[PDB]
Paper text:
Recently, Ups1, a yeast member of the conserved mitochondrial intermembrane space (IMS) proteins, was shown to mediate PA transfer between the mitochondrial OM and IM in cooperation with Mdm35. Mdm35, another conserved yeast IMS protein, is a binding partner of Ups proteins, and facilitate their import into mitochondria. Surprisingly, two distinct polypeptides of Ups1 and Mdm35 form a single compact domain, the Ups1 part of which corresponds to the START (StAR-related lipid-transfer) domain, likely functioning as a lipid-binding domain. Like other START domain-containing proteins, the Ups1–Mdm35 complex contains a deep pocket that can accommodate a lipid molecule and an Ω-loop likely functioning as a lid for the pocket.
Author numbering:
A (entry chain A): 3 to 77
B (entry chain B): 1 to 168
C (entry chain D): 1 to 169
D (entry chain C): 5 to 76
């Protein structure tokens, strides 16, 4: 039952709750063509707020921001 | 310098299982070096495909023979980008290190495609190792040359002076 | 890659003394690594200049950081070519290593020219360092990439199979 | 005295070098004569060295370099 940690320890529990919600949505709704919306909004935003706050203080942030603007599948 | 490697594997499982496993791959006993993984962004695009970007931190150790050339490196940040298309049962994935790229950049493209005829999911991988740092050898060669030149300049001058006096 | 270095020195002595010294510079306390020197050829050319080719053996040691990647080198052979022009009081010299050139080639051009105005012999040196070899580090980087690739191929598929089984049970 | 790379030739090298040095300073540089007054010493010495060079692994590299022209 050991879950994967967030790089920011204070966000691990929130990540666990979001991942759990996402997994159910993904397998039961998305892959079955039953939904294309975020039915895990509360869990997602609570989690990403935590992660973004932690990222502001990480030296890798500029590199990550740059990579997020790139399109590896060349879009 | 660019080095390309390719590999293929067949998972005798369906698309839902393989793609779900990709999102839940960590933790697993084969990758104890993965310290963490976070989902940075996720949304369904206008084409109905799931777009996800994740961030992983992985620990490691530099080969012994490298240590002198490179500074202390024990961990690396990796970005993982993926697109799941439920319409054609295809999942494109891409990963690359975010830091240490000046030393070496490792880019991986792995696509998982379900094949109805064989009831299996085929995974095709392509990995590119890129670097122009050459372990900083050029600078080390320049240092050696500068020192050698200086040493020889002096030895040549002084040796000649010594001999000139002896004969004089 | 090619690296160029230059230096000039003034010998407050005449041409006969400087050129004689060049031919008899070994041994001397400043060149303890020169093990021997031999004259390979010598003759006067159609211009009346003296042409000499000599062979030197010198002990040495590669940089400690390269040793782990390069064979054990303890000595090097050096060719020394010179032309003495008694009419113009000029002596051109050239040296380069004969072996280990795949690692590094060091070419030195030093010309000694007497200058009446200052009653001295000017020595102009130009040294070119040529090396296109990366101390055999490159192939090791390539070895590293193959090992890394294989490791990751297996960890990825074994990890995926592990989770597929876990989520399937 | 400096040694020859082939110890057995050092004596001959010493004798040749001595003859050459005298000729170089007293004749050549003074423009008196450009003739090799050291032919015997040179022949003996170079024959000793060449006999030793045949056994040396550097021989090919040396032969190659001797055909090159650094002074253009």
């Amino acid at each position: 039952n050991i879950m994967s940690a967030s790089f920011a320890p204070e966000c691990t529990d929130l990540k666990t709750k979001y991942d759990s919600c996402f997994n159910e949505w993904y397998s039961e709704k998305f892959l079955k063509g039953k939904s294309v919306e975020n039915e895990c909004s509360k869990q997602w935003y609570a989690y990403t707020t935590c992660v973004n706050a932690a990222l502001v203080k990480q030296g890798i942030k500029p590199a990550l921001d740059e990579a997020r603007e790139e399109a590896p599948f060349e879009n | 310098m660019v080095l390309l490697h390719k590999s293929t594997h067949i998972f005798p499982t369906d698309f839902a299982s393989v793609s779900r496993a990709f999102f839940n791959r960590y933790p697993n006993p084969y990758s104890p070096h993965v310290l963490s993984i976070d989902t940075i962004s996720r949304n369904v695009d206008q084409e109905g495909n799931l777009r996800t970007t994740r961030l992983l931190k992985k620990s490691g150790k530099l080969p012994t023979w490298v240590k002198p050339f490179l500074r202390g490196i024990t961990e690396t940040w990796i970005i993982e980008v993926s697109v799941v298309n439920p319409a054609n049962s295809t999942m494109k994935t891409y990963t690359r290190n975010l830091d240490h790229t000046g030393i070496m950049k490792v880019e991986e493209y792995t696509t998982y495609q379900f094949d109805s005829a064989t009831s299996s999911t085929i995974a095709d991988s392509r990995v590119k190792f890129s670097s122009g740092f050459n372990m900083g050898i050029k600078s080390k060669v320049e240092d050696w040359s500068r020192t050698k030149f200086d040493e020889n300049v002096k030895k040549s001058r002084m040796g000649m002076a010594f001999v000139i006096q002896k004969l004089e």
